[PDB]
Amino acid sequence: ATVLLEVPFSARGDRIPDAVAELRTREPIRKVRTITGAEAWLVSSYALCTQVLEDRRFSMKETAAAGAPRLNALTVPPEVVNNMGNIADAGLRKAVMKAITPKAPGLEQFLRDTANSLLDNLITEGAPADLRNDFADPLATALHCKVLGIPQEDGPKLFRSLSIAFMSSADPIPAAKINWDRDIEYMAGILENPNITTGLMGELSRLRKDPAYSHVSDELFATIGVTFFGGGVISTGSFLTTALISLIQRPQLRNLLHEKPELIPAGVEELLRINLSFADGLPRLATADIQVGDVLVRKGELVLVLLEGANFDPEHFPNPGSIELDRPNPTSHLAFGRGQHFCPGSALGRRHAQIGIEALLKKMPGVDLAVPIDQLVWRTRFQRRIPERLPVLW
Amino acid sequence: ATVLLEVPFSARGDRIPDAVAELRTREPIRKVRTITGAEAWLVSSYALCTQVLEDRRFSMKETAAAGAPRLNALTVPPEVVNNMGNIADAGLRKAVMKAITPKAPGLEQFLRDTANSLLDNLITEGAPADLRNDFADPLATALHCKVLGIPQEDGPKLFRSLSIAFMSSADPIPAAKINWDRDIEYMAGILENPNITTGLMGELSRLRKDPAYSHVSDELFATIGVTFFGGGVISTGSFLTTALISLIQRPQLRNLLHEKPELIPAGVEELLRINLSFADGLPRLATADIQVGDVLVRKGELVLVLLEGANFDPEHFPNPGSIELDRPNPTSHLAFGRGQHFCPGSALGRRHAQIGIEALLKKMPGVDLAVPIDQLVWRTRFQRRIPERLPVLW
Numbered sequence: 001a002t003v004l005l006e007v008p009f010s011a012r013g014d015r016i017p018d019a020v021a022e023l024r025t026r027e028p029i030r031k032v033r034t035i036t037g038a039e040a041w042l043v044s045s046y047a048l049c050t051q052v053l054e055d056r057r058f059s060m061k062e063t064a065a066a067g068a069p070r071l072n073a074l075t076v077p078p079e080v081v082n083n084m085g086n087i088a089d090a091g092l093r094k095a096v097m098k099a100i101t102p103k104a105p106g107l108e109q110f111l112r113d114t115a116n117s118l119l120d121n122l123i124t125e126g127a128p129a130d131l132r133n134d135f136a137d138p139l140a141t142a143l144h145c146k147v148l149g150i151p152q153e154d155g156p157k158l159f160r161s162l163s164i165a166f167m168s169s170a171d172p173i174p175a176a177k178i179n180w181d182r183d184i185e186y187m188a189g190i191l192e193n194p195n196i197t198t199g200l201m202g203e204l205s206r207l208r209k210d211p212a213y214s215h216v217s218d219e220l221f222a223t224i225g226v227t228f229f230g231g232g233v234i235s236t237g238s239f240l241t242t243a244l245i246s247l248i249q250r251p252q253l254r255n256l257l258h259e260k261p262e263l264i265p266a267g268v269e270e271l272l273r274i275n276l277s278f279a280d281g282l283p284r285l286a287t288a289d290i291q292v293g294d295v296l297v298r299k300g301e302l303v304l305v306l307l308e309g310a311n312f313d314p315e316h317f318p319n320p321g322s323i324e325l326d327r328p329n330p331t332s333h334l335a336f337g338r339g340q341h342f343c344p345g346s347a348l349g350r351r352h353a354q355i356g357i358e359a360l361l362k363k364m365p366g367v368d369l370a371v372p373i374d375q376l377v378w379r380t381r382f383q384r385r386i387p388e389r390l391p392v393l394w
Numbered sequence: 395a396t397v398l399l400e401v402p403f404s405a406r407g408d409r410i411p412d413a414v415a416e417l418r419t420r421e422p423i424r425k426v427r428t429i430t431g432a433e434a435w436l437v438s439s440y441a442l443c444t445q446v447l448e449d450r451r452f453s454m455k456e457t458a459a460a461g462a463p464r465l466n467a468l469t470v471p472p473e474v475v476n477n478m479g480n481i482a483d484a485g486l487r488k489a490v491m492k493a494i495t496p497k498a499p500g501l502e503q504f505l506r507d508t509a510n511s512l513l514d515n516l517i518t519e520g521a522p523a524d525l526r527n528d529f530a531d532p533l534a535t536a537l538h539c540k541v542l543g544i545p546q547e548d549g550p551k552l553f554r555s556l557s558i559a560f561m562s563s564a565d566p567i568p569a570a571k572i573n574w575d576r577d578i579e580y581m582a583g584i585l586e587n588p589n590i591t592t593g594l595m596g597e598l599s600r601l602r603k604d605p606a607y608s609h610v611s612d613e614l615f616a617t618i619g620v621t622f623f624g625g626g627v628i629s630t631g632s633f634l635t636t637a638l639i640s641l642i643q644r645p646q647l648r649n650l651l652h653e654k655p656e657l658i659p660a661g662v663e664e665l666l667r668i669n670l671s672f673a674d675g676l677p678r679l680a681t682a683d684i685q686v687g688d689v690l691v692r693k694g695e696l697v698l699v700l701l702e703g704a705n706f707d708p709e710h711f712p713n714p715g716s717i718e719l720d721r722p723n724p725t726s727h728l729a730f731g732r733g734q735h736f737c738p739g740s741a742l743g744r745r746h747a748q749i750g751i752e753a754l755l756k757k758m759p760g761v762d763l764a765v766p767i768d769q770l771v772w773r774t775r776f777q778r779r780i781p782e783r784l785p786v787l788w
């Protein structure tokens with residue numbers, strides 16, 4: 001007798017388990033047990049992943065319901081799971097989305113300047129350098145302070161919440177509440193701070209005092225700052241980190257992008273497609289009985305949309321493990337999700353990675369791992385897959 | 395068909411696998427495969443562990459031999475594996491051992507002052523605090539700068555080598571050589587630096603210019619600094635970290651030691667006994683055919699002495715998983731090894747932990763984990779078991 005198949009399969013973010021393709025072929029929707037002991041349906045084909053993400057009867061909001069089968073414990077208040085819904089209902093969606101595009105004057109130059117400064121500092125100190133802690137994450141943190149309009153010096157303290165805030169835990173996490181409450185207080189102060197006039201928090205600060213938003217809660221305004229800083233930083237920092245591993249492990253690709261930087265956007269799109277940064281399937285709760293492939297999912301059941309299931313599906317992306325810069329369907333991956341909850345920061349996440357990579361390849365054209373790849377230490381029980389340190393030489 | 399049992403069994407340092415007791419009972423010396431693919435004999439009973447460690451025909455030195463079956467790749471030059479032998483042959487053993495006792499005037503006060511400052515800073519910043527990165531390791535690093543006679547400001551840079559230097563890798567590690575060569579150059583400079591007159595490096599500096607040591611190599615003098623700083627810091631920092639977890643998970647014990655600090659030495663001895671800080675068995679190479687239990691180990695074969703095998707052996711330590719402050723054989727554990735290569739820093743390691751714990755319990759009598767224990771992230775492919783961060787509240 002064996003136990004019900006457990007998820008997640010592996011915290012390693014440098015390779016997809018052979019098991020994923022076997023599951024996709026044999027049983028692209030199948031029952032699994034999550035870290036809480038709850039049962040769930042793991043969906044691993046491109047077709048079924050899209051189906052689930054595009055049917056709102058598979059609800060994000062309802063995953064926060066008391067007594068629901070859980071992927072993991074909430075690390076935010078239950079109402080915050082519906083954060084984008086709350087933003088939309090408040091009439092704030094357009095303004096929030098506009099503030100977090102890479103289009104603001106000076107933003108891309110700021111990114112390039114920041115990347116180059118970080119890289120110059122690594123070069124001065126000499127190899128080995130840690131490209132996560134001393135490049136990708138600092139670049140992500142600087143970017144999000146700029147986007148939010150908050151002081152760069154405040155970034156580190158907000159950043160330090162994230163190793164707990166984005167845990168994927170069987171049980172509630174006391175420290176997550178301590179940090180959440182503290183970071184909310186910080187964002188509340190920012191909204192009352194007359195120095196903060198630019199970026200997302202500058203715009204929210206103004207809308208908060210506009211009559212069209214007088215009955216929008218101060219809690220929501222602060223929540224938007226905490227959730228967008230944390231989500232953006234953890235997502236961009238983690239993605240860039242694991243993309244750099246993928247790049248470094250492909251010297252031919254590294255050289256091509258170095259020689260022809262105009263190909264970096266197409267390269268970043270493939271790096272997004274093959275990215276293993278999301279450690280768990282995206283959770284949804286069925287609000288009706290719904291047929292998904294050979295399974296009738298029942299109302300109240302948990303469904304997990306495995307992004308790498310979709311993104312390595314050879315039926316949609318032939319030779320799925322290979323980076324090919326000339327695919328006919330390059331942005332059709334699910335790295336940013338799909339449907340109602342499609343990532344609002346997709347353009348910014350793309351630009352962060354594109355600029356970081358462009359800068360790294362110019363400054364460190366000889367970049368390579370400084371340790372055998374197996375020596376990377378993969379963070380466990382976390383909502384992202386990331387190496388604790390990424391040691392390189394050049 | 396299953397593969398030959400692989401070591402190590404688990405990188406988790408908060409619990410011993412049930413498998414260890416099963417092995418000890420069934421086959422206290424048995425064949426295993428190491429991360430390099432080499433075969434080895436894993437020894438897991440107190441009796442057989444002692445036998446191997448007390449028979450120099452199971453050689454430390456010879457583990458560095460070209461073509462030997464390997465636990466892992468060397469991270470130091472092969473001659474450095476015989477570092478203590480080299481120290482003894484140079485006539486330096488007594489002086490080195492004397493410099494690294496906790497007995498030097500002011501040393502214990504320095505430790506207490508340092509621990510208390512670190513803890514005051516955590517208290518000021520507010521919970522959660524990371525007791526590894528912001529307590530145990532800094533305390534270890536400060537201690538070793540003081541013991542060596544080198545500036546406190548140089549500690550951080552030396553410390554940063556250690557996440558690579560003490561890797562347990564299948565393959566050689568380029569960064570380990572970069573850092574080793576750099577740290578050797580630093581220690582060489584220290585020996586030539588007239589400001590350095592105290593501690594181990596002050597004493598070595600003087601002996602180096604004494605006629606009785608004129609033909610001792612500059613390489614050996616520098617090597618002693620690098621190996622004692624790194625080994626001491628990684629050993630004490632890692633031990634204290636995992637001891638604090640053991641303590642925190644036993645509130646009754648925490649309270650007893652808080653109420654009766656005179657029991658802290660006995661508590662630290664039990665924490666040493668149950669400690670899972672060594673990630674791999676201690677390696678030795680057979681230089682003869684030697685009977686160990688039911689196995690005739692052949693000349694040239696690798697033997698791995700599993701410390702927790704010995705230390706959780708109920709035949710030697712009844713109710714082995716329980717901390718009991720009144721055992722009749724409390725220091726008879728193998729936490730510091732046994733025989734020819736018994737730890738020269740044992741007294742200093744004991745004092746570091748005793749003082750760190752004393753200070754922590756006085757300042758933070760309410761100390762507890764701030765995350766569920768399963769959320770700790772255990773460093774992999776490393777010579778020690780340690781959580782990447784240790785989040786606490788108080």
Ligand code: HEM
Pocket residue numbers: 060084085100227228229231232233235236239282283334335336337338340341342343344345346348349350
């Ligand atoms: C490469 C970088 C990024 C990746 C791969 C990524 C990935 C994703 C994914 C997969 C989702 C879907 C969640 C779901 O459907 O369950 C999502 C949604 C979301 N993302 Fe991103 N993200 C990135 C960057 C960002 C940035 C820069 C921000 C904001 C500054 C951001 C904020 C959000 C928010 C607030 C949601 C929730 C959308 C909703 O619930 O409707 N992300 N992201």
Ligand code: HEM
Pocket residue numbers: 454478479494621622623625626627629630633676677728729730731732734735736737738739740742743744
């Ligand atoms: C709680 C703290 C410590 C623990 C648990 C510990 C553990 C050990 C163990 C198990 C060995 C035996 C290695 C073997 O036989 O294969 C050893 C040896 C050694 N230890 Fe420690 N150690 C600690 C602290 C220190 C300190 C503070 C120093 C120096 C400042 C140090 C330096 C060394 C050295 C140089 C050896 C090699 C001995 C030889 O090869 O003959 N250790 N230690």
